[PDB]
Every structure is written in structure tokens, then in C-alpha cells.
């Protein structure tokens, strides 16, 4: 395959698709190595902005942002306008997950009880249900009908209609005590990765403990449903064989793109990065490291591989002078 894009493109009509071999890999290595900031979202009528979480509206018209004061504001992406403000929590919105369909929304806070809630996103902004002692909540990856709350080393499973606890996944012996542990659903929904222990949702039985090499990072499922990514070490979900060691992936808030082709890493520990990595999903080769030159607090992307929202602290991490705005990137 050619390296020079113009030659690659000339072979692209020859010779399609992607000209020679490795696509594509070159095209993604060119595209996802490039990001132009196009707009900022400053908090309402406050002199100092206090966003802590970024998330796009399900249909992605508004980009939803969490305030530190526990609010939630949907800013119209095109217009810029704060279309609406809702009072969610009494502490700093740490997490936002819009129901793919846009009927619901999940929220997590800092210390205020309840720490998590489900809210009506249709016509009326109601509280649907509360998860009080759960510090992180995530939707089931399938057709989102359940909620996966964590409580430190312990997992929880809830029904979005009933709001009732169904499962409590935890084995104190198999537990790794991953500091920033987060219990996530598998791409098929039947498996759970929690505190480095892979489980089986239906049987409510543990499958494996991915040997401790990191101290904070719990890991994610690759969307192939074949591999699992505990910090660096890329393990196979059925074999438990180590596949590769990606040293560039150490200490990363990793999040795949919509098509599951490019990984977005966010380096953490002032704590969190001033920069972020991208890698090619197909073969774990890094693409780039982008220095946003500002302390990032969160990062998200749209389905369309068009925008990159990032919560950047405009001015040094001094108790006082903290201005968390939201910046927007193109690709």
C-alpha cells in the first residue's frame, strides 16, 4: 500500500477501496491526527463557567453540559444559545449519559445524596428514579433497559422502568481495589467487567480476575466483544491470553469512536491531562497525542465523527480562578 495520500488516492480509483492495503489505516492516521477548535460554550450569566461534564443530546442538536452546582444545561450546538436549565443534583455533575433514543438521561454527582438519577428527557423534565449510594451510573449496551451503577469495589444493576436493584456483583477475594473502578456492561450485555473481575450477568457468577498491573484503571470492553482492555495489557475475553501490551495506553480514559475504528485516550494524573491520545483500533498503533494546552476535565464525541467536545480549564487550578468552559473541535 502507498504512504503518500495523493498516490494512495490515485490507486483508490484503480484498485479500490482505500487504494492499496492497510486502508484506510493511513487515512485514519491522517484524519484522527487532526483537530480544529470551532466554538466555546460559556456558562449562562455567570462570570466564571463551571462545567464538569460534557455529553451530546441523543439526536445531537444540543450538547448537554453539567454544572459543578449540580445543574444541567442543554446548549443548542448550532446556535450556541442555552436553550434550557434543569436542577439535577446538589453536587458537581460527574457524569451524563443520554438514552440513545432520547427519552431518558442518567446523571452522577460528587457527594450529594442521591448521587445518581434517571430523568425524563421527552416533553417534561421529571426525576424518574434515584440511585442514592451509586457514584457512577451507566446504561446497558444493547437497547439500554438497565442501569449499571458502581459503589467503589461493588457493582449494581437496575431496571429503568421500576428503578429497582436487580444484581449486586462483588467478590472480595477476587477484587483488585482499582481506585477509579468502574463497572461497565459488555457490547452484548451478558458480561460485566468490575474491579478487574469479568463476570456473567445471568448466572451472577465470576469468570476471571485480570491479574493486577495498574492501580487506578478498571478497563473497558473492545466493541468487537472479543478483547478486553485493562489499562495497557489487551486480553482475550474467552482465552484470558495476553495479546498485546500498549504502553501508550497506560492510565487512559479510553473511549472508542462510533464506528469503533479510532480510540480516544485521556491521560489522568492538578490531576488530569492537558493532552489526549488517539490510536487505530484495528491494530493498536498510536495515531497522535494532542496537547489541548489546557487541563481537560472531560471529553466526548458525536456519532458523525464530526465534533469533539472537551471541558478545558481556562486558567490555573487554583481554588478561586477556575473557569471550566467547553470547547468544540472538528476533525
Amino acid at each position: 500500500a502507498p504512504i503518500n495520500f495523493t498516490s494512495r488516492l490515485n490507486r483508490r480509483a484503480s484498485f479500490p477501496k482505500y487504494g492499496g492495503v492497510d486502508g484506510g489505516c493511513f487515512d485514519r492516521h491522517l484524519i484522527f491526527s487532526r483537530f480544529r477548535p470551532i466554538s466555546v460554550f460559556r456558562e449562562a450569566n455567570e462570570d466564571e463557567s463551571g462545567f464538569t461534564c460534557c455529553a451530546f443530546s441523543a439526536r445531537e442538536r444540543f450538547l448537554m453540559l453539567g454544572t459543578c452546582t449540580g445543574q444541567l444545561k442543554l446548549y443548542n450546538v448550532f446556535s450556541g444559545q442555552e436553550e434550557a436549565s434543569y436542577n439535577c443534583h446538589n453536587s458537581a455533575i460527574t457524569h451524563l449519559e443520554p438514552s440513545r433514543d432520547g427519552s431518558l438521561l442518567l446523571t452522577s454527582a460528587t457527594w450529594s445524596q442521591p448521587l445518581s438519577a434517571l430523568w425524563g428527557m421527552k416533553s417534561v423534565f421529571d426525576m424518574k428514579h434515584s440511585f442514592t449510594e451509586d457514584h457512577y451510573v451507566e446504561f446497558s449496551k444493547h437497547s439500554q433497559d438497565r442501569v449499571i451503577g458502581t459503589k467503589g469495589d461493588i457493582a449494581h444493576i437496575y431496571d429503568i422502568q421500576t428503578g429497582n436493584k436487580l444484581l449486586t456483583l462483588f467478590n472480595p477475594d477476587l477484587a483488585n481495589n482499582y481506585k477509579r473502578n468502574c463497572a461497565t456492561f459488555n457490547p452484548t450485555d451478558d458480561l460485566v467487567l468490575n474491579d478487574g473481575v469479568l463476570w456473567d450477568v445471568r448466572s451472577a457468577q465470576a469468570i476471571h480476575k485480570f491479574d493486577k498491573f495498574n492501580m487506578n484503571i478498571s478497563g473497558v470492553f473492545h466493541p468487537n466483544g472479543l478483547e478486553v482492555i485493562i489499562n495497557t495489557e489487551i486480553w482475550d475475553l474467552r482465552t484470558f491470553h495476553l495479546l498485546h501490551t500498549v504502553p501508550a495506553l497506560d492510565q487512559c480514559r479510553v473511549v472508542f469512536n462510533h464506528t469503533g475504528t479510532v480510540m480516544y485516550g485521556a491521560m489522568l494524573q492538578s490531576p488530569f491531562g492537558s493532552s489526549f491520545r488517539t490510536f487505530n483500533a484495528t491494530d493498536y498503533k498510536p495515531i497522535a497525542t494532542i496537547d489541548v494546552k489546557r487541563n481537560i476535565f472531560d471529553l466526548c464525541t458525536d456519532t458523525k465523527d464530526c465534533y469533539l467536545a472537551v471541558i478545558e480549564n481556562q486558567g490555573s487550578m487554583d481554588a478561586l480562578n477556575m473557569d471550566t468552559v467547553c470547547r468544540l473541535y472538528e476533525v
Binding site: 466564571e48 463551571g50 464538569t52 439526536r59 442538536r61 444540543f62 459543578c68 452546582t69 449540580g70 442543554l74 436553550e83 434550557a84 436549565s85 434543569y86 436542577n87 439535577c88 446538589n90 453536587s91 458537581a92 460527574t94 460528587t110 457527594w111 430523568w119 425524563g120 428527557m121 421527552k122 416533553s123 417534561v124 423534565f125 421529571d126 426525576m127 457514584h135 477509579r180 489522568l268 494524573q269 490531576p271 488530569f272 487550578m317 481554588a319 478561586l320 477556575m322
Partner: protein
């Protein structure tokens, strides 16, 4: 497409009554992670710069509220 909901959530409510209560709930939660000598000292700062205004209230409710967030993230 498109449209945003109706805020029929939390509402403020009778503010100042609420604001005052939230500050003292937060003031305690802050105290369980930060030395109560540093936290007071931040309160004056805020007081000299803002004054006995509500605007200044929310700005310690913001400063406090942010520290705890970073603390949580570490």
C-alpha cells in the same frame, strides 16, 4: 429533531432560604476532606471580594463544590 423539555424539576425554590441551607450542607461535607482552617480562610477571601451578597454565596458554593469534584476524581 429537536425540542427541549419543560423544567418541571427541582425548582429553586424559595431561594435564599434554600441557598443558605445548601451552603451549610456543603460546608460540612467540605470539612470532612479539607482542614477547617484552610476552608474558613477561603470563605473570607470570598467575603472580601464579593461581600455579604448572595452572589458571593453561590461562589463559595461553587469553589467548595469544585474542590470536592477534583477530590472525587482523584
Amino acid at each position: 429533531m429537536e425540542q427541549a423539555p419543560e423544567d418541571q424539576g427541582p425548582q429553586r425554590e424559595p431561594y435564599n432560604e434554600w441557598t443558605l441551607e445548601l451552603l451549610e450542607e456543603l460546608k460540612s461535607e467540605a470539612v470532612r476532606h479539607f482542614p477547617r482552617i484552610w476552608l474558613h480562610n477561603l470563605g473570607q477571601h470570598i467575603y472580601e471580594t464579593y461581600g455579604d451578597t448572595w452572589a458571593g454565596v453561590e461562589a463559595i458554593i461553587r469553589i467548595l463544590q469544585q474542590l470536592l469534584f477534583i477530590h472525587f476524581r482523584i
